[PDB]
Amino acid sequence: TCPFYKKIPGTGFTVDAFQYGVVEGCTAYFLTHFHSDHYAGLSKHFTFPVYCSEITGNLLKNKLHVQEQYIHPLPLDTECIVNGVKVVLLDANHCPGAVMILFYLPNGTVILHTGDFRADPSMERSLLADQKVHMLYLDTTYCSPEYTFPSQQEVIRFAINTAFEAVTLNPHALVVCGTYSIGKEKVFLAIADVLGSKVGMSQEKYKTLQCLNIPEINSLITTDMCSSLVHLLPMMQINFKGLQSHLKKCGGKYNQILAFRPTGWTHSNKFTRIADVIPQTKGNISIYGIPYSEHSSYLEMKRFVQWLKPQKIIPTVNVGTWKSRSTMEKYFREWKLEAGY
């Protein structure tokens, strides 16, 4: 059965609620982004209206074969009317096509659902600045003070400098980057750009990336592995056995692998700066775990909420345990008392 935190009161709407069958009294199903814990349940047999971004709609049509007549893409930053309710989609700074949703209820309540997001001060100058929000459905993935991480910019600088140095030292080194969903494309694209290479990948991943509207993508990605020195592989193959085997497949073109695993957080962050990160090495294979997050850190999330001053917060992540819930509720109270709302 659908949980309460996926239902928008006073509407016929749900959010990211496709794995529960036909939800009672749902007239429109919203999808914030194309990640499997959120889209799980969609297919060519789905015949209810789905509301989403243009990019998410490309992925629905091409990857899951949802029929076009049921896909309702909305432009960002634009007031739209859905089943008589005004809505706006805003950029969530998560993966490509990821949105937050503002709902303007007929009785005057204003609700923001963040979907998955990485809070940023740039958001303080969208259509959010223009009115009060009464309820916030918040991505609380990293809602605990131990979750610090560097900016995306610092992490990309580290990866580019590391890859550029390694391949300059050894022109026969291969760089490999792990992936298992859309998101974090900047990792492999920035590395390929500094090395003057395209990124080689499977036909299926290349198809997924072509759905995204990324400018000059035919310019950075390819299915011809032979001509590329940056390869993308499934995250599951990013280990010593998987990479030894891949290296065998390249036919003596290469004699070393430098691999990257962009993780969310890892407890090395509590003791280590980005400058100080080192790889795991075995033989002629090195693996770097890099803290590239597409969710808010604790401090980024705190700042966003203290700026927005919602009257009620409803968490959407880590809700399954009483200890997690109570912990998060305590932080929300602190934030409110410290900010004065």
Contacts with Ni ion, residue ranges (CB under 5 A): 35, 116
Name which of 32 and 286 has its Cβ closer to Ni ion.
32
Name which of 35 and 261 has its Cβ closer to Ni ion.
35
Residue showing tokens 């929300």: 332
Name which of 40 and 80 has its Cβ closer to Ni ion.
40
Give least dist CB 149 to Ni ion, A: 16
In the chain, what is the greatest distance between 2 CA atoms, to the nearest angstrom? 68
Please state the three-class secondary structure of 144-157 as a single string: CCCCCCCCHHHHHH
Give least dist CB 218 to Ni ion, A: 27
CA–CA separation, 17 and 29 (whole Å): 7
E strands, the chain, are: 7-8, 13-15, 28-30, 50-53, 71-74, 80-82, 85-91, 99-104, 110-113, 135-138, 173-179, 199-200, 221-222, 230-234, 256-262, 280-282, 285-290, 312-315
Give least dist CB 293 to Ni ion, A: 11
R_g over Cα of the chain: 22
Name which of 116 and 185 has its Cβ closer to Ni ion.
116
**φ, ψ for residue 209 (rounded to 5)?**
-65, -40
CA–CA separation, 320 and 272 (whole Å): 30
Give least dist CB 141 to Ni ion, A: 9
CB 53 within 8 A of CB 74: yes
Name which of 92 and 221 has its Cβ closer to Ni ion.
92
Name which of 228 and 293 has its Cβ closer to Ni ion.
293
Give least dist CB 35 to Ni ion, A: 4
Give least dist CB 116 to Ni ion, A: 4
